[PDB]
């Protein structure tokens, strides 16, 4: 069990050496904007992971991309952008790439079934690329918002369909799980999809909006959630997603305190 930060906290050099001066076991680089996995950023990150020693997880680009689009060119562009992230991950010796499910476009709200086919198509094409590069894709459960796919474990199954691959699993977002139901009841079901939970996002909210609050500032029972993870022997990374560095560091300590309280129970 290792703790990380999403660089989502702004430019890269501006955010990186400031994160590095703390004690996070892993960095989650989100492949967007100025943090994009360009050659320059790969080389910069490659040298940073040598001065220090940390694990890297990469978050694929997601913004203004729809894996589930009826527009074929939008789908093709989505695989192309996610290919950049997988390649960077490969170069970075990273082993996990986080990917978002798509959404139902307004024009095609009555054709949810065929929208799901689209997302499946794109995801297969992407998992195929992950297989070439020995990279695992963690499909991420989404916050409860109108039109978005993969809110529920059941809807995640409908995108995953019959994909049988040692390279497809789940990124468990605890915060998103709270907008849809009880975050502890997601663990069993998500672990039963593909290779199961291979990455975790940690943040808090009040069960309605994706607020990304500091741990404790919402109503998620994290103690209970850590229990379900320790139950399934989750050795991966718990990555923190907050609005600023200090809240993330406060989240770090608080969650490492709950891990203390968890492990002593097994006596």
């Amino acid at each position: 069990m290792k703790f990380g930060v999403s660089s989502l906290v702004e430019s890269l050099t501006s955010s990186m050496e400031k994160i590095a001066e703390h004690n996070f076991d892993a960095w989650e680089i989100v492949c967007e904007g100025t943090h994009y996995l360009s050659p320059k950023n790969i080389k910069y990150l490659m040298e940073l992971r040598d001065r220090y020693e940390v694990e890297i997880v990469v978050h694929a680009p997601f913004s203004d991309l729809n894996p589930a689009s009826m527009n074929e060119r939008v789908r093709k562009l989505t695989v192309e952008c996610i290919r950049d992230a997988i390649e960077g991950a490969f170069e970075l010796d990273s082993e996990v790439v986080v990917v978002h499910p798509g959404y139902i476009p307004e024009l095609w709200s009555n054709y949810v079934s065929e929208i799901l086919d689209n997302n499946f198509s794109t995801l297969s094409e992407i998992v195929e690329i992950a297989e070439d590069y020995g990279i695992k894709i963690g499909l991420e459960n989404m916050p409860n918002f109108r039109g978005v796919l993969g809110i529920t474990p059941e809807s995640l199954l409908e995108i995953v369909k019959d994909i049988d691959s040692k390279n497809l699993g789940i990124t468990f977002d605890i915060g998103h799980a709270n907008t849809a139901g009880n975050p502890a009841e997601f663990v069993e079901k998500l672990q039963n999809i593909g290779i199961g939970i291979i990455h975790v996002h940690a943040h808090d909210n009040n069960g309605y909006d994706d607020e990304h609050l500091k741990i404790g500032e919402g109503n998620i029972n994290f103690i209970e959630v850590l229990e379900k993870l320790k139950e399934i022997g989750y050795d991966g990374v718990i990555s923190i997603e907050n609005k600023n560095i200090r809240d993330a560091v406060k989240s770090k300590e608080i969650l490492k305190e709950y891990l203390e309280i968890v492990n002593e129970k097994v006596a």
Copy 2:
């Protein structure tokens, strides 16, 4: 005088053939072809429409693709694909002898909530590129006001102005969507303000709702006062098409009769 039209989506996602043969037997002055899915302006579709536009003496307006595209995107490739797709529509329009291509304002994604100014700049760049393409083809862009939805641009006239900025072009005006306006305010009061952007109102979408969702009901089923809207459109001398956007033909056809009836009444107000 104002012409009445129907949008091709009253039949999406049917073939363009079945859609239009079904549309053809009703008596619309214009057809609005939305350049999406099976109705996309492909060589086969453009050639079919040309033949069909020679049998029926009708006017064609085209709606550019909008869906899953974002002209305001931080992602340059998404931005570029958006112009490529709109280029297709402008090119199809030109071959179809259309005067007007309808175009959508962009969207602010959650990730870039704190980049509004930069996002509008993006939408301005896209528009510039698209207007320039339009100028080469003798095509007019009708930038469409949007429904009242978090993150979407061009809901109000002043947000539309933030996309247009200083573009000085005989080829940029507004597509006035009445139903969208109703989700944001009084539809009749949009007319004056939209008429002041670029070359003014060059196309109109007519459909009804109860003031919150883009329901696309048939005229009368919501709470829009269409006499007022038509009254204000008359005052500005609007003589373009009024395009009905409904979910089915029967709604579209009855909307046509009700609006024609309302326009008759507006002419009586001139006493």
